[PDB]
């Protein structure tokens, strides 16, 4: 399965994996350190288990010799956490406090797992809670359906305007903004979306369960 | 005098680096300003140690400039001299009291030097100074220093109950001013656990789960706090309840899969977990349950096979195309994992037949055909997959490797050079570590290394139109070897840059107020040269470096009587061992943990540079973990013993007297076959690399090695010999 948690410095090298980038700009690494060491509570990652987060190959623990046979060897001897997504987040630091999604990325093979959504909800909540951010703005190109749906529909960003010919190729942009309120961003708000019990944090959970089971 | 120094800094500040150096170099053959200038120059050129000496000198010559202590604290931090950074931090603090940054950085230095109470007092004093309702732009930093203080009190508390209770009261007091709630709650729960207050902990874990119900770790800690970690009935009920709170999340659905024993209940939870993913067409479905196949194979395999075959039997291929193809994709992976390759191919073919536009299917089918030993067909299929996304790095590399396995040299070369068509560059960038990720680069290094061995053999055969062919091949051998070495050498640059990126953060984190994050960066930087990818690149590059050394000596003995874009310079080096050390090995050795240290590598490295007492140390430490009957141990000892007979005289003695206490444990192979047996493949390979040294009978040795590889498929065996024996048979050139 997939795990969702807060990014740390130990994640930033894993973020460079070519499976996470459409076009590779690997000179951004100091910029990544800069995020993680300036806003250390704002960024989140999605992970599965691995031996080397930098290895792009589906590495089969039960077939090593095939790796040696591929030249992955030292010519001398014979026989962790990968990111499947992440959100890199900052406060605007160049004006009410506002946050900025520097980078949102999910492996295509981990599509349809709700990863971009789960990551963004954590990031939005963090921006409000940790930095008291008042809003997040961004632009989306007119043809980028996945992104439009995620921000406008799933995350309920408001569309302020269509920026005409925003892009050099003539494409319009959707200028979007989400006003951040802590009570509205609480992750428990969305636990039953598109489908309602919740933990009250005061009840004795294990006791209540034992008593409920007694009914039947 | 001062003029020569400032001349250089100017020169560097322009870009004339070489002239800068000589100006500075002979300027040395002084003024506070002079020392300052040089300190700056040495920093700019990454001579941090030198920079520290020159900055200290500026001060010792009556420099009035107090910003020098900040320069020192930065440099001293970077090189790990925290004893002296503390002094610098204290000095700088005294001259610039009005900036919280200098208080935090002093506290951090005290904390790192083990002066925890002093660090605490430093932080507490500023805390008191900043009660006067801290402004909104100062609140974040204040929250961070409050939590950082708690960190130090938490560590100091250890397991002491009274001390822990006080850390908790402090934690509770600072909570309204701490905005890192995840951080605070996780700390709160941990303290609660250590106090034996498990019900309190469980409340916090339930709070953490509600804040992020997708984090597996909170669920496992919840179990321990509830004391039901071994209770299947109660765990079942717990996760059933948590599934109603959090129906979109994986941990309540997945964790019961790891412990349920009732066949019907497990089948049901497996169905509920897997089938909605298949119906959505989730490519990762199989990957998501693979850990269950890995840890509960015999139990879960039969259940999921039935579950997913049943599901498939209900799908209309034309009107349920997405479930159909992704269900076939799952079953293909299922039977591939079970090593039933014909069945795996049937299911992948059904998905491909239906929908041929999806790369995933070509990748999986090519792997299945590989396992069926159909190397050309597998490469062909992967190549079709490659046409669907010609810029994908993963499929570009995998396609190269497959054509190489199929011994299709021309196609491997063509596909491998796609992204580097011009000037061995990607889009104007010469230095690949600035544009590609480490995996693409190491894969290229390996591919070129293999392309190099291919040309190397063709040359040997030509030795036994033709002079033109030899000329063509001699040239391809250099090109492919250089490219391999050049690809490997890009890798260390990745990690050197990360280490050096730390420099600005020794002060920037203080100013931003992120001391906790800063300390994590420092631990991170101390481990950069031990990462899997770094270690992989180092060890694989090492065989090129060892062979340039070994083969030069070979050619030397051979001729005892006789009268840039493709890395040509790298492979003509006369100091291959020093090149390996400076580019790869020193930084790794400087950081590696003793329980992670590779003693075979250390032995073979120091053997080639003559340091024969390091060889002994490596041999000894190895035995202490792997035994004195291990084939590898016996091999190293034998080679070391022979060395005590070409190495430094006054140290062959030292080793011998160190080896005096291995006295209990001439044909040295026969001694090997009798005291160590002939089953340790790594022991045999080790002898093979030094067989003309000991000596070791090469024919009998090769036979043993080939016997030990009798298990493997014939084509695979060949590839092993090509990688592990060939390069040591015939010298390059």
Curated annotation (Swiss-Prot), chain A:
Keywords: Acyltransferase, Cytoplasm, Transferase
Gene Ontology MF term list: identical protein binding; protein N-terminal-serine acetyltransferase activity; protein-N-terminal-alanine acetyltransferase activity; protein-N-terminal-glutamate acetyltransferase activity
InterPro entries the record matches: Acyl_CoA_acyltransferase (IPR016181), Ard1-like (IPR045047), GNAT_dom (IPR000182)
The N-acetyltransferase domain, residue ranges: 34-181
Function: Catalytic component of the NatA N-terminal acetyltransferase, which catalyzes acetylation of proteins beginning with Met-Ser, Met-Gly and Met-Ala. N-acetylation plays a role in normal eukaryotic translation and processing, protect against proteolytic degradation and protein turnover.
Record's subunit section: Component of the N-terminal acetyltransferase A (NatA) complex, which is composed of ARD1, NAT1 and NAT5. Can self-associate.
Protein name: N-terminal acetyltransferase A complex catalytic subunit ARD1
UniProt source species: Saccharomyces cerevisiae (strain ATCC 204508 / S288c) (Baker's yeast)
Gene coding for it: ARD1
Curated annotation (Swiss-Prot), chain B:
One matching Pfam family: NatA_aux_su
Gene Ontology, cellular component aspect: cytoplasm; mitochondrion; NatA complex
UniProt modification remark: The N-terminus is blocked.
GO molecular function, one term: ribosome binding
InterPro entries (UniProt xref): NatA_aux_su, TPR-like_helical_dom_sf, TPR_rpt
Main location: cytoplasm
Compartment list: Cytoplasm
Domain of life: Eukaryota
Per-repeat ranges for TPR: 1-29, 32-65, 67-103, 182-215, 325-358, 393-426, 613-645
Keyword terms, alphabetized: Acetylation, Coiled coil, Cytoplasm, Phosphoprotein, Repeat, TPR repeat
SMART domains hit by this protein: TPR
Function: Non-catalytic component of the NatA N-terminal acetyltransferase, which catalyzes acetylation of proteins beginning with Met-Ser, Met-Gly and Met-Ala. N-acetylation plays a role in normal eukaryotic translation and processing, protect against proteolytic degradation and protein turnover. NAT1 anchors ARD1 and NAT5 to the ribosome and may present the N termini of nascent polypeptides for acetylation.
Remaining remarks: Present with 7600 molecules/cell in log phase SD medium.
Quaternary state and interactors: Component of the N-terminal acetyltransferase A (NatA) complex, which is composed of ARD1, NAT1 and NAT5. Can self-associate. NAT1 associates with the nascent polypeptide chain and the ribosome.
Name used for this protein in its record: N-terminal acetyltransferase A complex subunit NAT1
